[PDB]
Amino acid sequence: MQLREIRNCLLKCISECSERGLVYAVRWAAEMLNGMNPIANEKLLEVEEKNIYLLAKSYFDCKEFERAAYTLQNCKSSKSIFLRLYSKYLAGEKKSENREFYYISEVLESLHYQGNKDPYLLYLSGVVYRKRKQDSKAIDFLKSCVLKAPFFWSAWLELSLSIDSLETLTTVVSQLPSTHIMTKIFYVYASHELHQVNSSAYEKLAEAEIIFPNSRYLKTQRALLTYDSRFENILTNDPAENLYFQ
Amino acid sequence: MQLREIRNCLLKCISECSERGLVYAVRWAAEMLNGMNPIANEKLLEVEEKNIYLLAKSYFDCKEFERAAYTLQNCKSSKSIFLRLYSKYLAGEKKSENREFYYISEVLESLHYQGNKDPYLLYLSGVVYRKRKQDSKAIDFLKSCVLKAPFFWSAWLELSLSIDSLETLTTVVSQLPSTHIMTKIFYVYASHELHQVNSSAYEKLAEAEIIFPNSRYLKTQRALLTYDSRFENILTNDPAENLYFQ
Ligand SMILES: [Hg+2]
Ligand SMILES: [Hg+2]
Ligand SMILES: [Hg+2]
Ligand SMILES: [Hg+2]
Ligand SMILES: [Hg+2]
Ligand SMILES: [Hg+2]
């Protein structure tokens, strides 16, 4: 066998196993790949860190969050840094069930000061500030995240949870591209989550259904807005499920 | 926005979020993708099922194994069938903590009779027969799996657990490509797992270390073979960790 053939076979294993949920085979292959003799700023850094990132993500997928974080201790790409902090955050929360929280906040603030604008890090800064009850800051980070990654649902959801009134909701929406379908979807979600649904929400929802006529998510939104106007029954689901928290 | 642009943006979200472990954003994007108007035998079937597979895998990654299985109820590619059965198997085991076990065995046997030779299904048949204590059958399926997918670690591990003597171990190894590095690695693992380590195991291990000199896995194997001849100390780790069961 050629070295490059072995590498390629391990890499194809990783892909086929991760697609099928076989996280232990992925972890083993990633360990072996990393054990071989070694063979714009961000993209280069991601290529350089690719093997070590694969190993850290395999641990993360086995729920080894401490080990994933430690694996990434030397890495510098924004992708690596995100997984490292998100690992630390989940490992701190596993153990709560958060000693790591202040640490994560400081790393994120240094990153901001340095001028990092990676949308996944901006999302974690958002989550951190919301949890510190710093809502104005949370909103400003999450808006910056969804401007860059408008199809990233979890940022829009955290944005909605950072917003405490329809007035604040209309202020934020006034700063987002009003034509963009995700802005429309967010508006519907956040109006319902605030329980302040007017006519515009129904209009926006009808627009989103033209593009996604059979979405389980939008069907739920429609059922919720229908209850708002006042087999499965949406009222008998856990509301955490209907709100997409679970 | 073009329809194809929206689709492409959702697909790029899925990739970037799944790489970072953001399973909830992936599930939302997969639901939306599947809600759009719709737009050798196996490869074709995988292309056809690709969207629905993405949705089922997103549920599987959120630990929604029943829902993943139900999502795949109409699918026919071997990849889809594997995830469906593996979901059912994990959902049956979650609930044990297995009503699904007999059902999975029957689907796998029909598949075998039909002449399916997908190595991931052959692995699940292996796991099923081993658990029925049908070791000869387990071995025959797992050998067929690793002949097709020799870098798939979990099949080699299940093969080792199906083997109860060095004599059976030497019978099986006599049927595998003796030159192939994974055969060598398996031999080392299975000899230690049997506690029947002779000189050949040390030889095979030394050969594997030429290619993977810094593998965490092989370092552990070396420490274990060293204990066999009789910072971290391998004797104080959980043996389930050292044996790669966890
Ligand atoms: Hg290969
Ligand atoms: Hg593989
Ligand atoms: Hg690194
Ligand atoms: Hg996009
Ligand atoms: Hg995205
Ligand atoms: Hg299907």
Q: What single-letter DSSP state applies at residue B38?
A: P
- d(CA A45, nearest CA chain B) in Å: 15
Neighbouring residues of A9: CB distance < 8 A, sequence distance ≥ 6: B150, B151
Cα(B67)–Cα(B84) distance, rounded to whole angstroms?
A: 10
Helical residues (DSSP H) of chain B, grouped into ranges: 3-19, 23-34, 41-48, 50-61, 65-71, 78-96, 101-114, 119-131, 135-148, 153-161, 166-173, 181-194, 199-211, 216-229, 239-242
Neighbouring residues of A194: CB distance < 8 A, sequence distance ≥ 6: A163, A165, A166, A169
Q: How many residues does chain A have?
A: 246
- d(CA B1, nearest CA chain A) in Å: 8
Cβ-contact B162, B138 below 8 angstroms: yes
Report the 10 Å Cβ neighbour count for B201.
20
Cα(B124)–Cα(B122) distance, rounded to whole angstroms?
A: 6
Contacts of B79 in chain A (CB under 8 A): 19-20
Contacts of B152 in chain A (CB under 8 A): 13, 17, 22, 25
The encoded tokens of residue B139 equal: 């071995």
Closest chain B CA to residue A83: B20
Q: How far is the CA of B106 from the centre of ligand 1 (A)?
A: 30
**A150:B83 CB<8 A:** no
Give the closest of B29, B149, B181 to A151, CB-based. B29
The encoded tokens of residue A218 equal: 């939008």
Contacts A–B by Cβ distance under 8 A: 132
**Residue in the block written with tokens 């490869």:** B43
* Exp. method: X-ray
Cβ-contact B149, A13 below 8 angstroms: yes
C-alpha gyration radius of chain A:
21
Cα(A195)–Cα(A166) distance, rounded to whole angstroms?
A: 9
User: Exposure pattern of A133-168 as b/e (b: 16+ CB <10 Å)?
Assistant: eeeebbbbbbbbbbeebbbbbbbbbbbbbbbeeeeb
Contacts of A217 in chain B (CB under 8 A): 28, 31-32, 35
Return the HEC string of B221-244.
Answer: HHHHHHHHHCCCCHHHCCHHHHCC
Cα(B70)–Cα(A112) distance, rounded to whole angstroms?
A: 43
Cα(B228)–Cα(B196) distance, rounded to whole angstroms?
A: 9
The encoded tokens of residue B147 equal: 């002949």
Long-range pairs of A15-21 with CB within 8 A, sequence gap ≥ 24: A16/B120, A16/B149, A17/B152, A17/B154, A18/A61, A19/B57, A19/B79, A20/B79, A20/B82, A20/B83, A20/B86, A20/B120, A21/B57, A21/B60, A21/B61, A21/B83, A21/B86
Closest chain B CA to residue A180: B1
User: Exposure pattern of A89-103 as b/e (b: 16+ CB <10 Å)?
Assistant: bbbbeeeeebebbee
The encoded tokens of residue A208 equal: 């989103």
Domains of chain A: 1-246 (1.25.40.10)
Return the HEC string of chain A.
Answer: CCHHHHHHHHHHHHHHHHHCCCHHHHHHHHHHHHCCCCCCHHHHHHHHCHHHHHHHHHHHHCCCHHHHHHHCCCCCCHHHHHHHHHHHHHHHHHHHCCCCHHHHHHHHHHHHHHCCCCHHHHHHHHHHHHHCCCHHHHHHHHHHHHHHCCCCHHHHHHHHHCCCCHHHHHHHHCCCCCCCHHHHHHHHHHHHHHCCCCHHHHHHHHHHHHHCCCCHHHHHHHHHHHHHHCCCCHHHCCHHHHCCCC
Closest chain A CA to residue B121: A20
Cα(A32)–Cα(A226) distance, rounded to whole angstroms?
A: 54
The encoded tokens of residue A88 equal: 């630390």
**B35:A86 CB<8 A:** no
Cβ-contact B122, B111 below 8 angstroms: no
Cβ-contact B83, B57 below 8 angstroms: yes
Query: Where does chain A break, by residue before each gap (C–N > 2.5 Å)?
Result: 39, 97, 230
Cβ-contact A53, A79 below 8 angstroms: yes
Cβ-contact A45, A77 below 8 angstroms: yes
Cβ-contact A192, A163 below 8 angstroms: no
Neighbouring residues of B92: CB distance < 8 A, sequence distance ≥ 6: B98, B99, B100, B101, B104
> Which residue from A17, A245, A212, A62 is spatially nearest to B51, judged by alpha carbons?
A212
The encoded tokens of residue B71 equal: 């999502």
Cβ-contact B93, B75 below 8 angstroms: no
Neighbouring residues of A242: CB distance < 8 A, sequence distance ≥ 6: A220, A224, A234
Contacts of A9 in chain B (CB under 8 A): 150-151
